């Protein structure tokens, strides 16, 4: 199907407890494949998927180089941010970055992304057309003038549309057996009486990949988003995901309810009846 590569980075300042903590991870779809912890001893980009382990020393040295530079740039960025906003240097702040590209079923470029956050809120982002920046406040406006003057986009765009997609294609192939599989959800239904007049029906989805899924209850065929508890999709820790949807039902009316599941692993959407 469609595929994506993402790098997520977090920098957290520790005023008085030394230099900021810096963590970065890389993903392809939902599968993590790299990591860097500025607090770890190795002090290198470390593999987190068997398939990436193939990469030669040249890979780990260049990648390490880039992510290390980033941690230093982020370190300074937190300092600058304090200046821009005139914040106290006793406070702890967070600086996040998302980078990546999407491609389609044949590995053609789809979309590119390069955006930051400060303290959990949008700071600055590259626009969809990858030619201009969106800045969220006046501070971000300073960074935007500088990046336009510097012509940073020209570089990022060519990278996203060129190096990022080649990289993704390459990763997808080397990890074909893993990355290009789609495990469908094993499903089932549970019943939990709560009162003398009420019971709960829980609709389960297990062992599916990728994470993208839709679980929806119905009553006589009528959608129902009001009376339904839905949990967030959660990893099983083995590469698959889990989720469930639940409704309370009058005792004796379990049969009017149907559960619907949608996942790319399914040739046809599923309808389950108690």
């Amino acid at each position: 199907g469609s595929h994506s590569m993402r790098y997520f980075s977090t920098s957290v300042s520790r005023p008085g407890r030394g230099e900021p903590r810096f963590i970065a991870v890389g993903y392809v779809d939902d599968t993590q494949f790299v990591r860097f912890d500025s607090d770890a001893a190795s002090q290198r980009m470390e593999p987190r998927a068997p398939w990436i382990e193939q990469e030669g020393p040249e890979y780990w040295d260049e990648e390490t180089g880039k992510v290390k530079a980033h941690s230093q740039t982020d370190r300074e960025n937190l300092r600058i941010a304090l200046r821009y906003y005139n914040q106290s240097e006793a406070g702890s702040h967070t600086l996040q970055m998302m980078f990546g590209c999407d491609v389609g079923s044949d590995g053609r470029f789809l979309r590119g992304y390069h955006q930051y956050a400060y303290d959990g809120k949008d700071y600055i982002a590259l626009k969809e057309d990858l030619r201009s920046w969106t800045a969220a406040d006046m501070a971000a406006q300073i960074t935007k003038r500088k990046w336009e003057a510097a012509h940073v986009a020209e570089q990022q765009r060519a990278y996203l549309e060129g190096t990022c997609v080649d990289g993704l294609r390459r990763y997808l192939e080397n990890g074909k057996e893993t990355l290009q599989r789609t495990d469908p959800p094993k499903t089932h239904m549970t019943h939990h009486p709560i009162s003398d007049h009420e019971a709960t029906l829980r609709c389960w989805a297990l062992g599916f990949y990728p994470a993208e899924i839709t679980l929806t209850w119905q009553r006589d065929g009528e959608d129902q988003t009001q009376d339904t508890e839905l949990v967030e999709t959660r990893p099983a820790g083995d590469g698959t995901f889990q989720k469930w949807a639940a409704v309370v039902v009058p005792s004796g009316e379990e049969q009017r309810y149907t559960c619907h599941v949608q996942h790319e692993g399914l040739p046809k959407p599923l309808t389950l009846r108690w």
Binding site: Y7, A24, G26, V34, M45, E63, K66, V67, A69, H70, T73, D74, E76, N77, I80, A81, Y84, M97, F99, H114, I142, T143, K146, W147, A150, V152, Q155, Q156, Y159, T163, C164, D166, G167
Partner: peptide
């Protein structure tokens, strides 16, 4: 392929 980053 980890990106290049720039100063704020």
């Amino acid at each position: 392929r980890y990106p290049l980053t720039f100063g704020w």
